[PDB]
Amino acid sequence: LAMVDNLQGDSGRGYYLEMLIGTPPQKLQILVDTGSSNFAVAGTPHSYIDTYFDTERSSTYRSKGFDVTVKYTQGSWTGFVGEDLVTIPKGFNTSFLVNIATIFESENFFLPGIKWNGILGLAYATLAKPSSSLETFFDSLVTQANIPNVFSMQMCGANGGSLVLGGIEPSLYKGDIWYTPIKEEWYYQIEILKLEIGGQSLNLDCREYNADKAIVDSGTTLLRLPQKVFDAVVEAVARASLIPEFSDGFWTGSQLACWTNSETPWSYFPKISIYLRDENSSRSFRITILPQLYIQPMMGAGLNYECYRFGISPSTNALVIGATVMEGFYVIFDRAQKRVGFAASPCAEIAGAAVSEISGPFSTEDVASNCVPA
Numbered sequence: 001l002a003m004v005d006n007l008q009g010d011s012g013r014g015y016y017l018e019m020l021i022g023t024p025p026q027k028l029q030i031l032v033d034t035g036s037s038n039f040a041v042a043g044t045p046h047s048y049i050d051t052y053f054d055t056e057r058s059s060t061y062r063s064k065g066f067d068v069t070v071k072y073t074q075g076s077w078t079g080f081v082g083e084d085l086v087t088i089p090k091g092f093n094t095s096f097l098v099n100i101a102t103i104f105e106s107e108n109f110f111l112p113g114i115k116w117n118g119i120l121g122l123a124y125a126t127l128a129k130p131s132s133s134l135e136t137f138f139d140s141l142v143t144q145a146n147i148p149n150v151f152s153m154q155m156c157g158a159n160g161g162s163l164v165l166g167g168i169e170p171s172l173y174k175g176d177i178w179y180t181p182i183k184e185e186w187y188y189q190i191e192i193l194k195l196e197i198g199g200q201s202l203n204l205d206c207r208e209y210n211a212d213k214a215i216v217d218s219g220t221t222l223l224r225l226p227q228k229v230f231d232a233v234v235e236a237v238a239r240a241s242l243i244p245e246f247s248d249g250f251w252t253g254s255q256l257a258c259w260t261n262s263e264t265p266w267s268y269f270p271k272i273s274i275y276l277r278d279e280n281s282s283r284s285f286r287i288t289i290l291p292q293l294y295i296q297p298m299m300g301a302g303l304n305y306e307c308y309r310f311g312i313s314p315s316t317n318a319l320v321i322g323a324t325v326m327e328g329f330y331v332i333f334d335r336a337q338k339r340v341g342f343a344a345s346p347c348a349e350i351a352g353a354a355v356s357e358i359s360g361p362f363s364t365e366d367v368a369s370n371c372v373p374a
């Protein structure tokens with residue numbers, strides 16, 4: 001497990017792992033996505049990629065005989081399903097056989113500036129298309145590499161990250177690691193209890209946060225909250241610093257705000273906290289991100305030091321704990337013990353200052369019981 005620094009990328013276009021495919025090997029850059037379950041790579045040249053996997057040049061590729069199509073929150077692709085040997089340079093140097101989708105048609109999938117050309121779904125089989133029978137990349141890796149049915153991830157950006165496949169790397173986190181039970185095994189679903197802002201809880205039927213699901217998803221850039229909650233939050237974040245002028249367009253994500261001074265506008269925003277039920281019902285723990293993680297900066301340009309985008313987006317049906325939140329912790333996907341753990345991530349510092357916090361346990365016995373509506 002010296003898979004440390006095995007990921008390149010950032011909150012902007014995602015984190016990617018480098019893997020070698022076929023025989024001889026073809027070098028590809030895969031986007032790590034805990035929010036889905038298919039392995040797919042560019043099967044033809046395309047607008048924003050400079051390489052793709054050519055099945056005709058791999059003597060170890062076998063065609064499975066059918067096409068498959070996946071549609072994510074936004075974007076989709078269609079490709080031929082097949083098999084081939086894969087080698088993950090840093091980590092496992094003994095190739096294994098995995099299913100593989102070769103994209104021959106995509107729409108809003110590859111965006112400008114991405115450095116990857118394939119996506120690795122680390123979710124459950126249920127989510128796999130065409131069906132729960134097209135064994136997951138990880139499912140294979142587990143059997144063939146005979147490793148523990150576990151994997152943890154750490155994103156650094158504010159450098160790359162680490163996708164430790166099959167265990168937990170203790171050098172990546174200081175402090176205790178809290179675990180929350182995985183409610184449904186499809187997306188990595190967990191139950192959120194409260195949502196604090198500047199210490200002020202939102203005071204909303206906790207079922208609100210869990211309707212109809214709250215998932216941990218590296219494959220999603222922002223922290224997406226279902227509408228009603230998004231509003232509550234925005235209103236909150238605003239009230240706690242009505243002084244600055246960030247137009248409603250900023251909140252929508254339509255625009256970016258640019259600062260002309262050397263001083264960052266962080267000291268003016270509140271902290272945001274999410275409470276998750278601990279494995280011990282009666283208690284809960286809470287993860288927290290400071291504004292450096294949700295008032296994300298972009299290249300300066302012009303007479304501006306930099307411009308910032310809002311790291312929070314409104315959702316229709318789902319609470320997605322994406323990159324903006326994971327960027328602050330070391331997430332452990334303990335599929336074996338049906339639980340997800342979080343730990344304060346060291347690399348998540350800015351000027352020697354912690355940008356995320358985690359603490360517990362707090363009493364749950366007072367509010368809730370089960371916040372996941374049936």
Ligand SMILES: Cc1cccc(CNC[C@@H](O)[C@H](Cc2ccccc2)NC(=O)C2=Cc3ccccc3Oc3ccccc32)c1
Pocket residue numbers: 013031033034035036037070071072073074075076108109110119127187217219220221222224313
């Ligand atoms: C099977 C399925 C169907 C619906 C929902 C899910 C839940 N997770 C979504 C990720 O798998 C997907 C990964 C991905 C990565 C690169 C290109 C396409 C897809 N990202 C997203 O759909 C996604 C969602 C949203 C939605 C609103 C705001 C930010 C944001 O995050 C980003 C950011 C960049 C690219 C896709 C993406 C899964």
